[PDB]
């Protein structure tokens, strides 16, 4: 998993960014958010996630808001 806080999120359009200490920002999309409840991140929350990449580039997965 990895630690991060979410840089900002567009609740409305559902994508945003998680900055990570040392590396560069990772893009989350609402569909990487695990849990149960409506899929949005408040800016500033402390997520643990995974980074996944293929041809569109690294992007966050398994974003557990904390659920």
Curated annotation (Swiss-Prot):
Pfam families attached to this UniProt entry: CSD
GO molecular function: DNA binding; nucleic acid binding
Protein's recorded name: Cold shock protein CspB
Main location (coarse class): cytoplasm
GO biological process: regulation of gene expression
Function, in words: Binds to the pentamer sequences ATTGG and CCAAT with highest affinity in single-stranded DNA, and also to other sequences. Has greater affinity for ATTGG than CCAAT. Can act as transcriptional activator of cold shock genes by recognizing putative ATTGG-box elements present in promoter regions of genes induced under cold shock conditions.
Self-association state and partner proteins as the record states: Homodimer. Interacts with RNA helicase CshB when cells are transcriptionally active.
Deletion phenotype: A double cshB-cspB disruption mutant cannot be made.
Listed result of changing residue 17 to L: In strain: Globigii
